[PDB]
Design a protein around this motif. Structure first.
Motif, PDB file in Angstrom:
ATOM      1  N   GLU A  70      -1.854 -28.572 -47.081  1.00 19.17           N
ATOM      2  CA  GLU A  70      -1.783 -30.199 -46.851  1.00 19.17           C
ATOM      3  C   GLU A  70       0.044 -29.888 -47.500  1.00 19.17           C
ATOM      4  N   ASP A  71       0.847 -29.012 -48.076  1.00 20.11           N
ATOM      5  CA  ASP A  71       1.991 -29.389 -48.097  1.00 20.11           C
ATOM      6  C   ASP A  71       2.471 -28.460 -47.104  1.00 20.11           C
ATOM      7  N   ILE A  72       2.084 -27.713 -46.534  1.00 21.32           N
ATOM      8  CA  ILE A  72       2.755 -27.324 -45.678  1.00 21.32           C
ATOM      9  C   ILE A  72       2.856 -27.931 -44.199  1.00 21.32           C
ATOM     10  N   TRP A  73       1.685 -28.670 -43.839  1.00 19.81           N
ATOM     11  CA  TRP A  73       1.794 -30.021 -42.558  1.00 19.81           C
ATOM     12  C   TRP A  73       2.281 -31.128 -43.020  1.00 19.81           C
ATOM     13  N   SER A  74       2.661 -31.284 -44.160  1.00 17.23           N
ATOM     14  CA  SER A  74       3.292 -32.256 -45.149  1.00 17.23           C
ATOM     15  C   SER A  74       4.803 -32.017 -44.445  1.00 17.23           C
ATOM     16  N   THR A  75       5.434 -31.279 -44.652  1.00 15.17           N
ATOM     17  CA  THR A  75       6.906 -29.957 -44.469  1.00 15.17           C
ATOM     18  C   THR A  75       6.437 -30.398 -43.634  1.00 15.17           C
ATOM     19  N   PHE A  76       6.205 -29.498 -42.558  1.00 12.58           N
ATOM     20  CA  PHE A  76       6.273 -29.137 -41.510  1.00 12.58           C
ATOM     21  C   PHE A  76       6.622 -30.730 -39.692  1.00 12.58           C
ATOM     22  N   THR A  77       5.113 -31.652 -40.660  1.00 14.74           N
ATOM     23  CA  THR A  77       5.631 -32.597 -39.644  1.00 14.74           C
ATOM     24  C   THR A  77       7.019 -33.246 -40.476  1.00 14.74           C
ATOM     25  N   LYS A  78       7.254 -33.720 -41.990  1.00 22.78           N
ATOM     26  CA  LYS A  78       8.356 -34.834 -42.400  1.00 22.78           C
ATOM     27  C   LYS A  78       8.974 -33.007 -42.413  1.00 22.78           C
ATOM     28  N   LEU A  79       9.810 -32.126 -40.947  1.00 24.75           N
ATOM     29  CA  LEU A  79      10.641 -31.838 -41.564  1.00 24.75           C
ATOM     30  C   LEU A  79      11.964 -32.163 -40.483  1.00 24.75           C
ATOM     31  N   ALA A  80      13.069 -31.714 -41.222  1.00 28.44           N
ATOM     32  CA  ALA A  80      14.299 -32.694 -40.687  1.00 28.44           C
ATOM     33  C   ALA A  80      15.525 -31.643 -41.432  1.00 28.44           C
ATOM     34  N   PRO A  81      16.586 -31.850 -41.275  1.00 22.26           N
ATOM     35  CA  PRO A  81      17.796 -30.461 -41.726  1.00 22.26           C
ATOM     36  C   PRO A  81      17.953 -31.998 -43.158  1.00 22.26           C
ATOM     37  N   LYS A  82      18.817 -31.210 -43.846  1.00 21.68           N
ATOM     38  CA  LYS A  82      19.052 -31.183 -45.447  1.00 21.68           C
ATOM     39  C   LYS A  82      17.584 -31.449 -46.063  1.00 21.68           C
ATOM     40  N   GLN A  83      16.781 -30.841 -46.108  1.00 21.95           N
ATOM     41  CA  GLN A  83      15.578 -30.761 -46.824  1.00 21.95           C
ATOM     42  C   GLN A  83      15.429 -29.157 -47.615  1.00 21.95           C
ATOM     43  N   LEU A  84      14.932 -29.207 -48.812  1.00 18.64           N
ATOM     44  CA  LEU A  84      15.486 -28.650 -50.008  1.00 18.64           C
ATOM     45  C   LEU A  84      13.734 -27.583 -49.800  1.00 18.64           C
ATOM     46  N   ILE A  85      13.758 -26.425 -50.374  1.00 18.03           N
ATOM     47  CA  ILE A  85      12.230 -26.006 -50.383  1.00 18.03           C
ATOM     48  C   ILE A  85      12.505 -25.223 -51.950  1.00 18.03           C
ATOM     49  N   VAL A  86      11.797 -25.724 -52.638  1.00 21.97           N
ATOM     50  CA  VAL A  86      12.575 -24.794 -54.398  1.00 21.97           C
ATOM     51  C   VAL A  86      11.859 -23.457 -53.971  1.00 21.97           C
ATOM     52  N   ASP A  87      10.682 -24.003 -54.111  1.00 28.86           N
ATOM     53  CA  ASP A  87       9.685 -22.463 -53.969  1.00 28.86           C
ATOM     54  C   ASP A  87       9.324 -22.204 -53.091  1.00 28.86           C
ATOM     55  N   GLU A  88      10.166 -20.523 -53.197  1.00 30.35           N
ATOM     56  CA  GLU A  88      10.368 -19.423 -52.371  1.00 30.35           C
ATOM     57  C   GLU A  88       8.778 -18.867 -51.082  1.00 30.35           C
ATOM     58  N   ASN A  89       8.083 -19.539 -52.294  1.00 32.37           N
ATOM     59  CA  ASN A  89       7.047 -19.086 -51.627  1.00 32.37           C
ATOM     60  C   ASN A  89       6.618 -19.960 -50.453  1.00 32.37           C
ATOM     61  N   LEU A  90       6.492 -21.161 -50.722  1.00 31.15           N
ATOM     62  CA  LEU A  90       6.393 -22.142 -49.665  1.00 31.15           C
ATOM     63  C   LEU A  90       7.206 -22.151 -48.153  1.00 31.15           C
ATOM     64  N   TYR A  91       8.440 -21.375 -48.710  1.00 31.59           N
ATOM     65  CA  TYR A  91       9.064 -21.226 -46.808  1.00 31.59           C
ATOM     66  C   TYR A  91       8.750 -19.521 -46.516  1.00 31.59           C
ATOM     67  N   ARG A  92       7.971 -18.863 -47.532  1.00 29.34           N
ATOM     68  CA  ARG A  92       8.220 -17.478 -47.000  1.00 29.34           C
ATOM     69  C   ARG A  92       6.704 -17.699 -46.080  1.00 29.34           C
ATOM     70  N   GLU A  93       6.065 -18.424 -46.624  1.00 29.96           N
ATOM     71  CA  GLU A  93       4.611 -18.906 -45.799  1.00 29.96           C
ATOM     72  C   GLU A  93       4.987 -19.221 -44.791  1.00 29.96           C
ATOM     73  N   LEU A  94       6.156 -20.945 -44.621  1.00 33.63           N
ATOM     74  CA  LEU A  94       6.565 -21.423 -43.298  1.00 33.63           C
ATOM     75  C   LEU A  94       6.192 -20.208 -42.329  1.00 33.63           C
ATOM     76  N   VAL A  95       7.275 -19.248 -43.432  1.00 29.41           N
ATOM     77  CA  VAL A  95       8.435 -18.428 -41.950  1.00 29.41           C
ATOM     78  C   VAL A  95       7.091 -17.402 -41.319  1.00 29.41           C
ATOM     79  N   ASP A  96       6.757 -17.311 -42.283  1.00 30.14           N
ATOM     80  CA  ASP A  96       5.536 -16.503 -41.412  1.00 30.14           C
ATOM     81  C   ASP A  96       3.981 -16.665 -40.980  1.00 30.14           C
ATOM     82  N   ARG A  97       4.140 -17.392 -40.821  1.00 32.29           N
ATOM     83  CA  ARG A  97       3.334 -18.735 -39.975  1.00 32.29           C
ATOM     84  C   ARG A  97       3.833 -19.397 -38.751  1.00 32.29           C
ATOM     85  N   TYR A  98       4.754 -19.954 -38.857  1.00 30.94           N
ATOM     86  CA  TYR A  98       5.167 -20.533 -37.723  1.00 30.94           C
ATOM     87  C   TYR A  98       7.072 -20.353 -38.541  1.00 30.94           C
TER      88      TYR A  98
END
Length: 98
Positions: A70-98
């Motif tokens: 659900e956090d992945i979904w919110s971050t992808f829908t609520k995705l815009a420049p100048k956003q921060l991803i503190v937890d590197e695991n979340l970014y790794r999941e985003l890049v690997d999946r989408y």
């Protein structure tokens, strides 16, 4: 995009449901096996509490996966420049999946 990740959500919630059903069936089989022995009331309560806590932990882990997605979904829908991803695991999941 909504269609593809809606089927993606269907798949993840379906594997979550399959895991829940498999774990619940295993726990039910174990509980029935215990009930066959007809152990003491103290033993019955002990094993029932153990199984209940195991199911609570399984549901908690499933909810952890669900809220991660659900956090992945919110971050992808609520995705815009100048956003921060503190937890590197979340970014790794985003890049690997989408």
């Amino acid at each position: 995009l909504e269609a593809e990740m809606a089927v993606e959500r269907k798949a993840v919630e379906d594997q979550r449901d399959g895991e829940l059903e498999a774990r619940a069936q295993k726990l039910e089989a174990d509980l029935a096996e215990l009930e066959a022995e007809g152990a003491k009331a103290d033993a019955r309560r002990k094993v029932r509490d153990g199984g209940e806590r195991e199911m609570r932990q399984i549901r908690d882990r499933a909810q952890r996966e669900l809220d991660r997605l659900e956090d992945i979904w919110s971050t992808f829908t609520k995705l815009a420049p100048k956003q921060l991803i503190v937890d590197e695991n979340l970014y790794r999941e985003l890049v690997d999946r989408y």
